[PDB]
């Protein structure tokens, strides 16, 4: 059993390496196979898995015909989170009955999510007095407000969306809780074109540098 | 006892490996590298899967591969093969999936809906450009050209359909022209073909 144990350990190390290569750990797998000939064979694979921060369950029944393969059906369960768009995207992929694009989209969504949460934690750590946790580091939006003067506030909203083909893309927009007192004070009125300008600035020099410069201007 | 537990662990990890094969991509570690298997599918239709050999040594080299050459990878290799290998694999997976979907749409059209087609379709190996002609039954002739210049997606960005030899006489004809334009620009090919033909 020693040689078998060593071979199993080597295979387990290989499986862990591949799991790191995909970023997804499949906890369980149950296989069933039936044959229905007039040679059609239906195979059902139940599996629970998880990405870095997320856990999922899914089962799918696929058909193989004597030399084509196509998934007959599938069901899939997420966990309840704020990002309800993930659930509707899961549903849409369920009608699409597509797996590879679904998993790549989920990994990309978590990769952007981890990036967003890490950036939020870093900016909160940098300046913890001008950074307010409106809903949390794992939320969609952040808000910077001056403690001495609560009239101003600036909220950056970040939402990750999925294209119909399966492409993923983030989106960031600004909004200012600004009194008309300050608007009356200065007649320059550049806040009208603020969203597009800030988007261009972020595209020029990223998100973290943009927010760092923004909070530097708030000194 | 111990043998039974070892067998149970082995069959569990084998089932997990099969599940890993059934999703995303596959990889089988070897002595000289990993013969990484990439899987392709579209609209719940399993498609042909490829594989590429790897060398784990620092001078990263591809000593063997099965991906067709017309798919650009050497530029992507210079881009992200040395650095951020994960993005390299994700991008190549997307590109192969898009190519497989395009080829599946093309040969599905050739095999199934050739009934209303009046001529062979001209297709590139990468299937970025498609040019064909079709008759729909009143009977109207059309000739369509699709530009899949966005390589990462399976949907064209610019499509143009027209006819030569007939002068415009019915606004309804231009209406079906625009409808087909939108159908190619938005929805898959065989799907909209089965949609209007039926």
């Amino acid at each position: 059993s020693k040689d078998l144990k060593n071979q199993l350990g080597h295979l387990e190390s290989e499986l862990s390496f591949l799991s790191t290569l995909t970023g997804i750990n499949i906890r369980n797998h149950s296989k069933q196979t039936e044959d229905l000939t007039s040679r059609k064979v239906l195979q059902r694979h139940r599996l629970s898995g998880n990405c870095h921060m997320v856990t999922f369950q899914l089962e799918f029944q696929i058909l193989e015909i004597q030399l084509s393969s196509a998934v007959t059906d599938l069901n899939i369960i997420m966990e309840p989170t704020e990002c309800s768009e993930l659930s509707e995207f899961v549903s849409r992929a369920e009608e699409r009955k597509d797996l590879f694009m679904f998993f790549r989209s989920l990994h990309f969504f978590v990769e952007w999510f981890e990036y967003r949460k890490r950036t939020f934690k870093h900016l909160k750590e940098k300046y913890p007095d001008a950074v307010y946790l409106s809903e949390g580091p794992s939320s969609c939006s952040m808000g910077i407000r001056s403690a001495s003067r609560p009239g101003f506030e600036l909220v950056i909203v970040w939402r990750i969306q999925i294209d119909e083909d399966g492409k993923v893309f983030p989106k960031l927009d600004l909004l200012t809780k600004v009194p008309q007192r300050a608007l009356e004070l200065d007649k320059n009125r550049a806040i009208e074109t603020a969203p597009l300008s800030f988007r261009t600035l972020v595209g020029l020099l990223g998100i973290e540098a943009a927010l760092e410069s923004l909070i530097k201007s708030l000194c | 006892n111990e043998q039974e537990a070892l067998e149970e662990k082995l069959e569990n990890v084998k089932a997990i490996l099969q599940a890993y094969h059934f999703t995303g991509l596959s990889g089988k570690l070897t002595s000289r590298g990993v013969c990484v298997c990439i899987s392709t599918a579209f609209e719940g239709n399993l498609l042909d899967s490829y594989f590429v050999d790897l060398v784990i040594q620092k001078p990263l080299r591809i000593h063997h591969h099965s991906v067709p050459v017309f798919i650009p990878l050497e530029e992507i290799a210079a881009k992200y093969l040395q650095t951020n290998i994960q993005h390299f694999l994700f991008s190549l997976c997307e590109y192969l999936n898009a190519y497989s979907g395009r080829k599946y749409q093309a040969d599905r059209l050739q095999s199934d809906f050739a009934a209303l087609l009046t001529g062979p379709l001209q297709r590139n190996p990468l299937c970025n450009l498609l040019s064909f002609t079709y008759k729909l039954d009143q009977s109207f002739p059309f000739c369509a050209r699709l530009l899949y210049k966005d390589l990462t997606a399976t949907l064209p960005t610019d499509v143009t359909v027209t006819c030569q030899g007939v002068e415009v006489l019915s606004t309804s004809w231009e209406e079906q022209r625009a409808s087909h334009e939108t159908l190619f620009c938005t929805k898959p090919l065989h799907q909209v073909f089965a949609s209007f033909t039926r």
């Binding site: 790191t20 | 620092k58 951020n84 994960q86």
Partner: peptide
């Protein structure tokens, strides 16, 4: 980098 990540996970 990629090499350092691969070596850190291989160990």
């Amino acid at each position: 980098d990629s090499y350092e990540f691969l070596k850190a996970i291989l160990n």
